Ligand binder design. Structure first.
Ligand SMILES: C/C=C1/CN2[C@H]3C[C@@H]1[C@H](C=O)[C@@H]2Cc1c3[nH]c2ccccc12
Length: 254
């Protein structure tokens, strides 16, 4: 038995893991799927969350409650990788392996905004399609909020998923933030902390929102201890290939 803590990306929520949580449990493991602040059915509203630590606070509540005797495996995807990073900085010893599936993997050597800068470098400005962006917070120093466009979701996140999974996410997706202006002010991670945590990576070769060539770039520039691939996972591998993410994760963790 291991304890997996599962962390969703932006605009999503704990619900994305609904297909993978049973699977890990039927193999005999403990699973936690967290909702981050203003995501899923978390009661907070976006415009009351201005920092990324505030956003990541329900993950941090989980990590503080890992008994002294225990460790967890973390799985994050997309923007979830950033929360994995804070978890890994603050509680390095409570994590046996941090697993990043088609996620940005922070590097103690750069500002926390660096994977975002590199994404703008490597991807076109129209990458998010019908998604839409607006400022919130103080007009004097603003946040950016985003909503996922229906086409963006169908073509570029859930394209190897059932229309059912696509429909559920339209019902459940909420405005998100990538916290860029706050992340630009956050303390960097260190190698003594963040950097002491074994890391794994799971490629999702068919992720059109985060192309594999760019996922491959985080492993080449930061490194990972283990690395797997899902030939047919899209951005939502946990929904499109839930049995393969399970298999990868038991491999990585055993
Ligand atoms: C919530 C929709 C998004 C679209 N896109 C955006 C933001 C999110 C999503 C992950 O949740 C991916 C992957 C990603 C994005 N920006 C990145 C920067 C560095 C590495 C990966 C990314």
């Amino acid at each position: 038995q291991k304890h997996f803590v599962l962390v969703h990306g932006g605009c999503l929520g704990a619900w994305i893991w609904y297909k993978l949580k049973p699977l890990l449990e039927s193999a005999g493991h403990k699973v936690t799927a967290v909702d981050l602040s203003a995501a899923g059915i978390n009661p907070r509203r976006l415009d009351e969350i201005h920092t990324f630590r505030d956003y990541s606070e329900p993950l941090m509540e989980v990590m503080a409650s890992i008994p002294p005797d225990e460790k967890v495996v973390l799985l994050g995807h997309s923007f979830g990788g950033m929360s994995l990073g804070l978890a890994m900085e603050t509680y390095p010893e409570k994590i046996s392996v941090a697993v990043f599936m088609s996620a940005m993997m922070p590097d103690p050597n750069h500002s926390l905004t660096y994977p975002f800068e590199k994404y703008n470098e490597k991807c076109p400005a129209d990458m998010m399609l019908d998604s839409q962006f607006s400022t919130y917070g103080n007009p004097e120093n603003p946040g950016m909020s985003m909503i996922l466009g229906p086409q963006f979701m169908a073509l570029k996140m859930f394209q190897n998923c059932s229309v059912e999974d696509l429909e559920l996410a339209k019902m459940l997706t909420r405005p998100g933030s990538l916290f860029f202006q706050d992340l630009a002010k956050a303390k960097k991670f260190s190698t003594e902390r963040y950097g002491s945590v074994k890391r794994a990576y799971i490629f999702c070769n068919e992720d059109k929102s985060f192309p594999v060539e760019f996922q491959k770039w985080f492993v080449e520039s930061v490194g990972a201890d283990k690395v797997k691939e899902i030939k047919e996972a899209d951005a939502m591998g946990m929904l499109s290939q839930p049995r393969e993410v399970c298999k990868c994760l038991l491999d990585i963790s055993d």
